[PDB]
């Protein structure tokens, strides 16, 4: 399934997203929610105009591939809508960590 993220119709976005997940895990800050990933997407010039909806489509697609561990964010909120939203937080699976480590090692 991982080959899909490596070479699917959004392989660039998938690679960037899992690379940010790997970055945050290597610093032990892995249980990330969509907002910081959206910020990272907007940081890169190519995806600078990113949107939350496309991010959610791709992330749901990924959790279908078990790239991530999904938790429901029922513990705290900052706005009324945020409270009403059944948000989620995501953590990368060990397999994802290892594959991204191999890709980074080839990069090195």
């Amino acid at each position: 399934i991982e080959a899909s993220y490596l070479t699917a119709d959004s392989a660039a976005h998938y690679r960037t997203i899992l690379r940010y997940f790997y970055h945050q895990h290597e610093r032990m800050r892995d249980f990330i929610a969509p907002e910081e990933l959206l910020e990272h997407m907007r940081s890169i010039p190519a995806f600078a105009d990113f949107q939350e909806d496309q991010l959610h489509q791709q992330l749901a697609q990924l959790v279908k591939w078990n790239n991530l561990i999904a938790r429901q964010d029922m513990t705290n909120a900052k706005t009324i809508e945020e409270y009403k939203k059944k948000r989620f937080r995501y953590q990368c699976t060990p397999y994802t960590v290892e594959i991204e480590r191999m890709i980074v090692q080839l990069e090195k």
Binding site: R27, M28, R29, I32
Partner: protein, 50 residues
Amino acid sequence: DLNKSAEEYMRIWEDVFRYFQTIRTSTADYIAYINSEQTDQRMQTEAFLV
């Protein structure tokens, strides 16, 4: 008082600022960890223990 070769000085500077940039990256990452909203949401669970 500058009574030695230039290569020694370049090596000394290289070591100094390689290590200083190492420490600078370390402090940037560590302060990001401390400030992490991951921590701020992680207070509400056992994950805070982690």
